Enzyme design. Structure first.
Site, PDB file in Angstrom:
ATOM      1  N   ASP A   1     -87.774 -25.573 -59.692  1.00  0.00           N
ATOM      2  CA  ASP A   1     -86.701 -24.885 -58.967  1.00  0.00           C
ATOM      3  C   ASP A   1     -87.408 -23.660 -58.369  1.00  0.00           C
ATOM      4  O   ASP A   1     -88.374 -23.151 -58.965  1.00  0.00           O
ATOM      5  CB  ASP A   1     -85.600 -24.394 -59.921  1.00  0.00           C
ATOM      6  CG  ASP A   1     -84.692 -25.517 -60.420  1.00  0.00           C
ATOM      7  OD1 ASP A   1     -83.931 -26.077 -59.599  1.00  0.00           O
ATOM      8  OD2 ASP A   1     -84.739 -25.838 -61.632  1.00  0.00           O
TER       9      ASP A   1
ATOM     10  N   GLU B   1     -76.251  -9.311 -52.902  1.00  0.00           N
ATOM     11  CA  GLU B   1     -75.384  -8.169 -52.609  1.00  0.00           C
ATOM     12  C   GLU B   1     -76.026  -6.855 -53.027  1.00  0.00           C
ATOM     13  O   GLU B   1     -75.892  -5.854 -52.323  1.00  0.00           O
ATOM     14  CB  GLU B   1     -74.021  -8.299 -53.309  1.00  0.00           C
ATOM     15  CG  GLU B   1     -73.158  -9.464 -52.836  1.00  0.00           C
ATOM     16  CD  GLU B   1     -71.699  -9.319 -53.266  1.00  0.00           C
ATOM     17  OE1 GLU B   1     -71.451  -8.892 -54.419  1.00  0.00           O
ATOM     18  OE2 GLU B   1     -70.804  -9.640 -52.454  1.00  0.00           O
TER      19      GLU B   1
ATOM     20  N   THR C   1    -113.649 -34.829 -96.839  1.00  0.00           N
ATOM     21  CA  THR C   1    -114.984 -34.806 -96.248  1.00  0.00           C
ATOM     22  C   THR C   1    -115.038 -34.891 -94.717  1.00  0.00           C
ATOM     23  O   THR C   1    -115.690 -34.062 -94.075  1.00  0.00           O
ATOM     24  CB  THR C   1    -115.854 -35.923 -96.858  1.00  0.00           C
ATOM     25  OG1 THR C   1    -115.820 -35.807 -98.287  1.00  0.00           O
ATOM     26  CG2 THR C   1    -117.302 -35.820 -96.368  1.00  0.00           C
TER      27      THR C   1
ATOM     28  N   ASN D   1    -114.298 -45.398 -90.031  1.00  0.00           N
ATOM     29  CA  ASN D   1    -113.559 -46.477 -90.673  1.00  0.00           C
ATOM     30  C   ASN D   1    -114.233 -47.795 -90.349  1.00  0.00           C
ATOM     31  O   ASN D   1    -114.218 -48.717 -91.157  1.00  0.00           O
ATOM     32  CB  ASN D   1    -112.101 -46.520 -90.205  1.00  0.00           C
ATOM     33  CG  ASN D   1    -111.277 -45.368 -90.752  1.00  0.00           C
ATOM     34  OD1 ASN D   1    -111.024 -44.385 -90.056  1.00  0.00           O
ATOM     35  ND2 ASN D   1    -110.863 -45.483 -92.011  1.00  0.00           N
TER      36      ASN D   1
ATOM     37  N   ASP E   1     -81.992 -25.260 -66.433  1.00  0.00           N
ATOM     38  CA  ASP E   1     -81.522 -24.192 -67.330  1.00  0.00           C
ATOM     39  C   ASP E   1     -80.109 -24.277 -67.911  1.00  0.00           C
ATOM     40  O   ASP E   1     -79.851 -23.670 -68.957  1.00  0.00           O
ATOM     41  CB  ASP E   1     -81.666 -22.842 -66.637  1.00  0.00           C
ATOM     42  CG  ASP E   1     -80.752 -22.713 -65.450  1.00  0.00           C
ATOM     43  OD1 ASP E   1     -80.523 -23.748 -64.781  1.00  0.00           O
ATOM     44  OD2 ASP E   1     -80.274 -21.590 -65.182  1.00  0.00           O
TER      45      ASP E   1
ATOM     46  N   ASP F   1     -78.363 -29.514 -66.197  1.00  0.00           N
ATOM     47  CA  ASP F   1     -79.735 -29.965 -65.979  1.00  0.00           C
ATOM     48  C   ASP F   1     -80.229 -30.724 -67.193  1.00  0.00           C
ATOM     49  O   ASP F   1     -81.315 -31.306 -67.171  1.00  0.00           O
ATOM     50  CB  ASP F   1     -80.680 -28.791 -65.737  1.00  0.00           C
ATOM     51  CG  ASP F   1     -80.446 -28.126 -64.407  1.00  0.00           C
ATOM     52  OD1 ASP F   1     -80.188 -28.860 -63.425  1.00  0.00           O
ATOM     53  OD2 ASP F   1     -80.528 -26.874 -64.351  1.00  0.00           O
TER      54      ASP F   1
ATOM     55  N   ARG G   1     -84.005 -14.602 -45.894  1.00  0.00           N
ATOM     56  CA  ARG G   1     -82.649 -15.136 -46.072  1.00  0.00           C
ATOM     57  C   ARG G   1     -81.780 -14.229 -45.192  1.00  0.00           C
ATOM     58  O   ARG G   1     -81.661 -13.029 -45.470  1.00  0.00           O
ATOM     59  CB  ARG G   1     -82.228 -15.007 -47.542  1.00  0.00           C
ATOM     60  CG  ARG G   1     -80.822 -15.546 -47.850  1.00  0.00           C
ATOM     61  CD  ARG G   1     -80.075 -14.598 -48.778  1.00  0.00           C
ATOM     62  NE  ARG G   1     -79.912 -15.066 -50.156  1.00  0.00           N
ATOM     63  CZ  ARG G   1     -79.036 -15.995 -50.545  1.00  0.00           C
ATOM     64  NH1 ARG G   1     -78.235 -16.582 -49.664  1.00  0.00           N
ATOM     65  NH2 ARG G   1     -78.927 -16.307 -51.829  1.00  0.00           N
TER      66      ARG G   1
ATOM     67  N   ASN H   1    -112.092 -39.951 -96.112  1.00  0.00           N
ATOM     68  CA  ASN H   1    -111.211 -39.977 -94.959  1.00  0.00           C
ATOM     69  C   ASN H   1    -110.191 -38.848 -94.921  1.00  0.00           C
ATOM     70  O   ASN H   1    -109.606 -38.567 -93.874  1.00  0.00           O
ATOM     71  CB  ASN H   1    -110.506 -41.331 -94.881  1.00  0.00           C
ATOM     72  CG  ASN H   1    -111.484 -42.488 -94.843  1.00  0.00           C
ATOM     73  OD1 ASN H   1    -112.660 -42.304 -94.545  1.00  0.00           O
ATOM     74  ND2 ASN H   1    -111.000 -43.688 -95.129  1.00  0.00           N
TER      75      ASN H   1
ATOM     76  N   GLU I   1    -117.098 -48.190 -92.748  1.00  0.00           N
ATOM     77  CA  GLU I   1    -116.581 -48.469 -94.078  1.00  0.00           C
ATOM     78  C   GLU I   1    -116.208 -49.939 -94.241  1.00  0.00           C
ATOM     79  O   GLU I   1    -116.483 -50.546 -95.277  1.00  0.00           O
ATOM     80  CB  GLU I   1    -115.364 -47.581 -94.362  1.00  0.00           C
ATOM     81  CG  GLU I   1    -115.734 -46.122 -94.569  1.00  0.00           C
ATOM     82  CD  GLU I   1    -114.530 -45.226 -94.717  1.00  0.00           C
ATOM     83  OE1 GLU I   1    -113.463 -45.724 -95.129  1.00  0.00           O
ATOM     84  OE2 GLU I   1    -114.654 -44.015 -94.434  1.00  0.00           O
TER      85      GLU I   1
END
Ligand SMILES: C/C=C(/C)C(=O)O[C@H]1C(C)=C2[C@H]([C@@H]1OC(=O)CCCCCCC)[C@@](C)(OC(C)=O)C[C@H](OC(=O)CCC)[C@@]1(O)[C@H]2OC(=O)[C@@]1(C)O
Ligand SMILES: Nc1ncnc2c1ncn2[C@@H]1O[C@H](COP(=O)(O)OP(=O)(O)O)[C@@H](O)[C@H]1O
Ligand SMILES: [Mg+2]
Ligand SMILES: [Mg+2]
Ligand code: NA
Length: 994
Positions: free
Chosen positions: A351, A442, A799, A768, A703, A707, A560, A796, A771
């Site tokens: 936005d 304003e 260590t 793994n 916000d 939304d 604007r 696992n 292993e």
């Protein structure tokens, strides 16, 4: 009645068959409640603790471990001997992990709130209605309210249902609809019907929305809708119908488990096939029962070896750490898995107001008519310095400072700005600077009046609190504001009726001061003011006015613009109905054009750079704004979204233009568009849908509860820190500062976190792999177990967990944001890398099996049986080898296992170092590039020796301190791993580039 706003007050009474003075009868209340249900959103699913606990066992991998826990539990039972002291350790360990595992999972669900249940904060407990069975009003539970009910609301009340206002008791009714329309300023409501059946909420000026608040007034109305049928309930239903997919990493992680599960079973089948020769052995003899145990035993080690038990905790630690880091940079990430998706952001929808810009209004220019003599015409343009709301600044004519008072046209310009304005200033003695009291547009006009000072006042004689509203007060005392005709998007203008202060017995001298969008205001002007005189508005002069407005609003000023006018002879007061906003435009006609003020809402100072970062990162940026198309495009050019002179005809749409395109074309427009102006309430959601139909990872800002749907849908919903609690709960991230650049910085942080995650993930899964090879090699060769479940788990979890975590702190590449978004489908391991870990795995598997095998043979301390066959047997029920003695059960010695584990640990502390970089040699990128890593390794080894010497532990792990000779054989087997990967990296760098 879904269409109530377009129905007359009488038609709604007729629709429901209810009297406005008595309300519904008890029979009506019964039938209505029966037909429409209670006025409440459905309650969330009753997810119980038991259900929650069970869910922490849905994962395939947790099931495998569960199974292995059972087997482990059975073996530590159907065994011979009184070595029970270390029997149930293994099973309890596994179970303990799964237990702690489930605990965590549950702990999260207890503290995770969802956006839907956050909407129930906007529904009051009570409401007030008039029902036939009672004269006075009776307050009841809001859930008991129903369509048809005559309701009463007063200032301070939270609206109970969507209501069609029947009668406004007070002078005016004001509502705070912020949560639903964004309009932070309270809005005036009326009772006339709004003709368009498809009017958006902002335009239903005769409706009160459930969850909204009465700012001022008292009113009577009839309930049009309740429950899920209200504006907020429909928001609740969109949200409930929105399913959010798992992040790319969760998807990969889940496919890994499905495949890991398929491999484990296949390795079990293999271990079986490789030993099918057992069917060729005699039936009598051999320990069958002591053989099935051997198989079941390797299954347990198999399962424990394939699962990276400590991975989930490592990921979570890295995410929590990174998350706290992101916070310090104003990015509050709510969902940990979101950090990943954030790095993948390919499209950011932002936005404008307050995120791309500061929302700090400031008038920079203004102009009046100077002379109008036939075809000739001249304007009087000025500039104003100061971008703060502070009355500190000056007016200028061609950079030359002038006095506003010397131009009458400016006196009236300032009068209109001061009078036709509901805002003001307030010097905050605390902060030390002036702040706004109302809308920014304003207030800028207020601030402009003080800078102009058309009457020359002793402002430099007043304090700082009195300086604030000085020149405004002066103009206020000269004109009495009778009433004000509020602004409405239909006419895009506002006006106030005024009559002089010092005027005796007379009925002449009133004026209307009009402020609003230029096009409309100027079209209703029949006269043009030239100083103090007036002349008929002409074609030429009009174009002149419009050309400058166009230049200002569409050129590099991106201002604007507001046209200021005055109706010299406003209709008699008695001839005006201040109740039907539908007649305000007619009252603001036959105007006299006075001037134009152009204001700026400046881009954030960092937005320019951040937008460039996005282009560098291949991240598309779409701006969503309320500016008309032209100014929207101009602003996009200004900040870098569009090139200063590039074609954008097909890359920017207003909501209207977009709705007119056929579904096929909207989808297309979304893939190339970067600017959406005047967008409808449903468009953000549709834009996210279309973007996702191109597999884009979308971030969208928002916000208010309106939304909430788009926020929930987007891969990364982004809420304002200054926004509603509902928007926040529906988002993955909150900008504490609301700044667009905080998104970009979070994205970069996200790219960095993941790269490091890719490393420690491959590191862990890599181990793994080794292993499993070790457990496989041992199972194939029928060798004594080199590594047991408790040891693997310690490896696992502890260590390797340390190094893994340390890797999370690997320094980030310098070209992080110079690369396109990473593809979600990008696998973590494949191609040459798959081969590398295939190799490292085989290596590790052989190295650990060989290390134990070594002790069992060529080593001193061990039964030196060179090229002997442990494979031959493991029962001594025949005793072929040993020829004289009384010893056999030595295969269960801790020394050999300790050799395997030490090799594992050493190769892993090594492979961690090999993990600092995917393809860069340790020669180019030295180990010390990451100090945490080195230090973690030091701690891991220390923890290793710990489990070796502190008596209680070596028994539990079945380990024995090694001789200085043995330790070196560990270094002889481990260290070479670095060279292997170094060689493989070299290959990827020199024979795999192009
Ligand atoms: C954990 C340990 C092991 C041994 C395992 O079985 O992992 C496989 C597996 C499940 C995958 C594989 C493993 O495959 C092998 O090792 C081949 C079979 C040889 C072993 C047999 C011994 C007799 C990964 C580990 O292999 C290598 C060598 O790197 C790479 C990758 O994994 C990733 O990218 C990790 C995703 C988080 C996956 O192919 C993955 O499957 C997928 O879907 C992926 C895309 O995921
Ligand atoms: N307080 C106001 N009084 C009179 N006119 C206004 C006011 N605020 C905005 N306008 C004008 O009406 C147009 C649309 O207003 P609005 O719907 O509030 O847009 P936005 O979301 O950009 O603020 C603007 O382009 C502006 O020129
Ligand atoms: Mg909003
Ligand atoms: Mg506005
Ligand atoms: Na989302």
């Amino acid at each position: 009645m879904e269409a109530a706003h377009s129905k007359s007050t009488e038609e709604c009474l007729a629709y429901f068959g209810v009297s406005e003075t008595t309300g519904l009868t008890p029979d009506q209340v019964k039938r209505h409640l029966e037909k429409y249900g209670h006025n409440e959103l459905p309650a969330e699913e009753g997810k119980s603790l038991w259900e929650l606990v069970i869910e922490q066992f849905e994962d395939l991998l947790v099931r495998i471990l569960l199974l292995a826990a059972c087997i482990s539990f059975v073996l530590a039972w159907f065994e011979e001997g009184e070595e029970t002291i270390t029997a149930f350790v293994e099973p309890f360990v596994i179970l303990l992990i799964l237990i702690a595992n489930a605990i965590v999972g549950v702990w999260q669900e207890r503290n995770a709130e969802n956006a839907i249940e956050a909407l129930k904060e906007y529904e009051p407990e009570m409401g007030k209605v008039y029902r036939a069975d009672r004269k006075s009003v009776q307050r009841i539970k809001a859930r008991d309210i129903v369509p048809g009910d005559i309701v009463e609301v007063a200032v301070g009340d939270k609206v109970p249902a969507d209501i069609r206002i029947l009668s406004i008791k007070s002078t005016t009714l004001r509502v705070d609809q912020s949560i639903l329309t964004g309009e932070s300023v309270s809005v005036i409501k009326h009772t006339e019907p709004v003709p368009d059946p498809r009017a958006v909420n902002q335009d239903k000026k005769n409706m009160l929305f459930s969850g909204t608040n009465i700012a001022a007034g008292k009113a009577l109305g009839i309930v049009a809708t309740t429950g899920v049928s209200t504006e907020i309930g429909k928001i609740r239903d969109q949200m409930a119908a929105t399913e959010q997919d798992k992040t790319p990493l969760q998807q990969k992680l889940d496919e890994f488990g499905e495949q890991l599960s398929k491999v484990i079973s296949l390795i079990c089948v293999a271990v079986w096939l490789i030993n099918i020769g057992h069917f060729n052995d005699p039936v009598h003899g051999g320990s069958w029962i002591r053989g099935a145990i051997y198989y079941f035993k390797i299954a347990v080690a198999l399962a424990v070896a394939a699962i990276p038990e400590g991975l989930p905790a490592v990921i979570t630690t890295c995410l929590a750490l990174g998350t706290r880091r992101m916070a310090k940079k104003n990015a509050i990430v709510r969902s940990l898995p979101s950090v990943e998706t954030l790095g993948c952001t390919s499209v950011i929808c932002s936005d404008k107001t307050g995120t791309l810009t500061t929302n700090q209004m400031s008038v920079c220019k203004m102009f009046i008519i100077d002379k109008v003599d036939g075809d000739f015409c001249s304007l009087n343009e000025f500039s104003i310095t100061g971008s703060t709301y502070a009355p500190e600044g000056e007016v200028l004519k061609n950079d030359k400072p002038i006095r506003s008072g010397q131009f009458d046209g400016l006196v009236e310009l300032a009068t209109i700005c001061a009078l036709c304005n509901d805002s003001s200033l307030d010097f905050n003695e605390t902060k030390g600077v002036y702040e706004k009291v109302g809308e920014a547009t304003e207030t800028a006009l207020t601030t402009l009046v003080e800078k102009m000072n058309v009457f020359n006042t002793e402002v430099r004689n007043l304090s700082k609190v009195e300086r604030a509203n000085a020149c405004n007060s002066v103009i206020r005392q000269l004109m009495k504001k009778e009433f004000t005709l509020e602004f409405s998007r239909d006419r895009k203008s506002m006006s106030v009726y005024c009559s002089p202060a010092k005027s005796s017995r007379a009925a002449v001298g009133n004026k209307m001061f009009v402020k609003g969008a230029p096009e409309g205001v100027i079209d209703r002007c029949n006269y043009v003011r030239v100083g103090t005189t007036r002349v008929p508005m002409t074609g030429p002069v009009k174009e002149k006015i419009l050309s400058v407005i166009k230049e200002w609003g569409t050129g590099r000023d991106t201002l604007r613009c507001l046209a200021l006018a005055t109706r010299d002879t406003p209709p008699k007061r008695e001839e005006m109905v201040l109740d039907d906003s539908s007649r305000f435009m007619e009252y603001e006609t036959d105007l006299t054009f006075v001037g134009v003020v152009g204001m700026l809402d400046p881009p954030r100072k960092e937005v320019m750079g951040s937008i460039q970062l996005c282009r560098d990162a291949g991240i598309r940026v779409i701006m969503i704004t309320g500016d008309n198309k032209g100014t929207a495009i101009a602003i996009c050019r200004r900040i870098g979204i569009f090139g200063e002179n590039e074609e954008v005809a097909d890359r920017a749409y207003t909501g209207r233009e977009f709705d007119d395109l056929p579904l096929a074309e909207q989808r297309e427009a979304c893939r190339r568009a970067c600017c959406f102006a005047r967008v409808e309430p449903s468009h953000k959601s549709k834009i996210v849908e279309y973007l996702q139909s191109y597999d884009e990872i979308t971030a969208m800002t928002g916000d208010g509860v309106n939304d909430a749907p788009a926020l929930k849908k987007a891969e990364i919903g982004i809420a304002m820190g200054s926004g509603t609690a509902v928007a926040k709960t529906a988002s993955e991230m909150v900008l504490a500062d609301d700044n667009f650049s905080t998104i970009v910085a979070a994205v970069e942080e996200g790219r960095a976190i993941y790269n490091n995650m890719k490393q420690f993930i491959r590191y862990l899964i890599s181990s793994n792999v080794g292993e499993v090879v070790c457990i496989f090699l041992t199972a194939a060769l029928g060798l004594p177990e080199a590594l047991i479940p408790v040891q693997l788990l310690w490896v696992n979890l502890v260590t390797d967990g340390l190094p893994a975590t340390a890797l999370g702190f690997n320094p980030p590449d310098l070209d992080i944001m110079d690369r396109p978004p990473r593809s979600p489908k990008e696998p973590l391991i494949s191609g040459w890398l798959f081969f590398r870990y295939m190799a490292i795995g085989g290596y590790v598997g052989a190295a650990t099996v060989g290390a134990a095998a070594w002790w069992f043979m060529y080593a001193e301390d061990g039964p030196g049986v060179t090229y002997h066959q442990l494979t031959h047997f493991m029962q001594c029920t025949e005793d072929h080898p040993h020829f004289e003695g009384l010893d056999c059960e030595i295969f269960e010695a801790p020394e050999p296992m300790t050799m395997a584990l030490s090799v594992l640990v050493t190769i892993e502390m090594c492979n961690a170092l090999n993990s600092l970089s995917e393809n860069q040699s340790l020669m180019r990128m030295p180990p010390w590039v990451n100090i945490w890593l080195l230090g973690s390794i030091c701690l891991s080894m220390s923890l290793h020796f710990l489990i070796l010497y502190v008596d209680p532990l070596p028994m539990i792990f079945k380990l024995k301190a090694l001789d200085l000779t043995q330790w070196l054989m560990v270094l002889k087997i481990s260290l070479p791993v670095i060279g292997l990967d170094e060689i493989l990296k070299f290959i990827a760098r020199n024979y795999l580039e192009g």
